[PDB]
PDB file of C-alpha atoms in Angstrom:
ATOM      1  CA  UNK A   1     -17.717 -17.280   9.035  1.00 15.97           C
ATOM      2  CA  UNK A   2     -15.425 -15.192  11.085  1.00 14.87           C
ATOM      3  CA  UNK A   3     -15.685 -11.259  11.435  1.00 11.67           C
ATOM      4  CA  UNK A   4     -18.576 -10.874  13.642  1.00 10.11           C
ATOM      5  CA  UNK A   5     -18.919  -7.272  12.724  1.00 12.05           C
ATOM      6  CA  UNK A   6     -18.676  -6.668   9.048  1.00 10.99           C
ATOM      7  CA  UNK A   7     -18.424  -2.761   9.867  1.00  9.42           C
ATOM      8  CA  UNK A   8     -15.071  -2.488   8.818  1.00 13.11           C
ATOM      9  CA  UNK A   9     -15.018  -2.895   4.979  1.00 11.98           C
ATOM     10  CA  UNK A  10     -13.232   0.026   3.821  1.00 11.53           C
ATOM     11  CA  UNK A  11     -11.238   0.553   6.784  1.00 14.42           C
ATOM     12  CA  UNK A  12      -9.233  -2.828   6.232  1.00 12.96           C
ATOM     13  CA  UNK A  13      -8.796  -1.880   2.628  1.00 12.42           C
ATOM     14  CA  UNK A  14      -7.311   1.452   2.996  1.00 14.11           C
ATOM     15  CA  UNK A  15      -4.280  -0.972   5.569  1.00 16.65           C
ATOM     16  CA  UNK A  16      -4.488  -2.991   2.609  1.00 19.03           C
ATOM     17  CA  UNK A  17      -2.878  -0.651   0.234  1.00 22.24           C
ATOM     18  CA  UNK A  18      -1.001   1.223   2.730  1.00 23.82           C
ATOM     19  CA  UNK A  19       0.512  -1.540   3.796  1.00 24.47           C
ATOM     20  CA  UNK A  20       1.746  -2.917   0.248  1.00 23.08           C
ATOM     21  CA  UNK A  21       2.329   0.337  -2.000  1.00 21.51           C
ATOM     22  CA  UNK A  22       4.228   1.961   0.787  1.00 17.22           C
ATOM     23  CA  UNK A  23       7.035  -0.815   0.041  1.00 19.29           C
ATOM     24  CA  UNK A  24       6.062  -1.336  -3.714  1.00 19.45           C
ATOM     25  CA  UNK A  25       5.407   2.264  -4.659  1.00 21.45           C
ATOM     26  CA  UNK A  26       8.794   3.539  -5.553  1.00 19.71           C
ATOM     27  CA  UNK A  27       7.340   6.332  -7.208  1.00 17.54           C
ATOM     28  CA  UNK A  28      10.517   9.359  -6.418  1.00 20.26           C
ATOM     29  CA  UNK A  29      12.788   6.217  -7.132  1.00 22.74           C
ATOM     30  CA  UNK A  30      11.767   5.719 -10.314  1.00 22.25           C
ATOM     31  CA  UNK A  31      12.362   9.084 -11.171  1.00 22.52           C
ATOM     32  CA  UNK A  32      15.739   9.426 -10.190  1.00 25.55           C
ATOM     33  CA  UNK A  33      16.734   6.017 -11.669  1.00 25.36           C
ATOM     34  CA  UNK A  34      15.921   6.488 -15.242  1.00 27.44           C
ATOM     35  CA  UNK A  35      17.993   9.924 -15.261  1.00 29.89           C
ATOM     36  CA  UNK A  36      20.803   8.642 -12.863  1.00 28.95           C
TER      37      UNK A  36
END
């Protein structure tokens, strides 16, 4: 249903998680909120 392509599988995941950890990530944050 929907998608008539299927030839994007990984593609759409990689958006996925660039799209989400990019604001969740927080990873040089962290660092300089446990010391400061």
């Amino acid at each position: 249903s929907d998608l008539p392509a299927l030839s994007t599988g990984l593609l759409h995941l990689h958006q996925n998680i660039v799209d989400v950890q990019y604001m969740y990530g927080l990873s040089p944050a962290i660092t300089k909120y446990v010391v400061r």
